[PDB]
């Protein structure tokens, strides 16, 4: 399969549903197949510029291995979830498991 | 975005500010935005600039 790295920005008002959404996505990836090499919750951070009249957001980092169907459903779920204001998905070669900066 | 000091004089503030602006070089973009430059003209200008740069480098090495 292909390794992907996903960064999600969650609305600070929905900060206490992030665990539920993360577990749901992890369960979907696992039932497809999936190897969640890394998952980090950077926390609630201030934004460099306001997004959607908001100044803070919850930052979530995931590194997954999945197939085309898992990717398509994951992206569609990200699009339709209103708590997620901005998501970045980048493909990577190699699985990255070490702790990253901003994990503090 | 120049912030004056406590006892900072007005003329010194104006001066420090507009070569802060000269360092920023916004006025160059403003001048560029007055008229449309065709791609052929832009490429000719950039080629001339590259030639001048290379001739300057040789002189400064010598």
């Amino acid at each position: 399969m292909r390794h992907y790295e996903i960064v999600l920005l969650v609305h600070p008002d929905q900060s206490d549903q992030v665990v539920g959404m993360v577990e749901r996505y992890i369960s979907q990836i696992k039932e497809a197949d999936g190897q969640i090499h890394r998952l980090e919750d950077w926390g609630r951070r201030q934004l460099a510029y306001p997004i959607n009249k908001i100044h803070k957001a919850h930052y979530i980092l995931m590194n997954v291995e999945c197939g085309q169907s898992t990717l398509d459903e994951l992206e569609e779920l990200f699009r339709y979830n209103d708590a997620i204001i901005r998501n970045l998905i980048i493909r990577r070669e190699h699985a990255i498991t070490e702790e990253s900066l901003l994990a503090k | 975005q120049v912030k004056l000091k406590e006892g900072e004089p007005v003329d010194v503030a104006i001066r420090r500010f507009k070569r802060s602006c000269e360092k920023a070089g916004v006025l160059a973009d403003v001048r560029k935005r007055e008229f449309y430059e065709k791609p052929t003209q832009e490429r000719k200008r950039k080629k001339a600039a590259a030639v001048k740069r290379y001739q300057k480098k040789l002189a400064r090495e010598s």
Partner: protein, 117 residues
């Protein structure tokens, strides 16, 4: 009637004119002056002296509202920005800061054609 201690000066200085407007924060205008409003018609409207005379007029007009310190924003490649910022200090305000806010497109709309003078 309304009193306010802190305000912002906006100097819109083009190559044909220079408008100085004194507002309070959140962008509510209090007094404004232009080179056209002090005579200086036509080509003479762009000289730095006209920018100066518009600037003191605006400063004195705002003195009625009674602001002692202000922050300055200059936009445009005008010849009168020097005079406009200088005249406020002569009027007697305290300049907290001064910044340039000329908008820069990130390769947006096509500008008009070149003049073949």
């Amino acid at each position: 009637t309304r009193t306010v201690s802190e305000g912002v000066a906006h100097i819109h200085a083009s190559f044909n004119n220079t408008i100085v407007t004194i507002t309070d924060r959140q962008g509510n205008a209090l007094a404004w002056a232009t080179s056209g409003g002090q005579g200086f018609r036509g080509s003479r409207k762009s000289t730095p002296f006209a920018a100066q005379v518009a600037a003191e007029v605006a400063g004195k007009a705002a003195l009625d509202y009674g602001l002692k310190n202000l922050d300055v924003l200059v936009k445009g490649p005008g010849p009168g920005r020097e005079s406009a910022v200088r005249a406020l200090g002569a009027v007697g305000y305290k300049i907290n800061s001064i910044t340039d806010v000329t908008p820069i497109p990130h390769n947006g709309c096509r500008p008009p054609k070149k003049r073949r003078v």
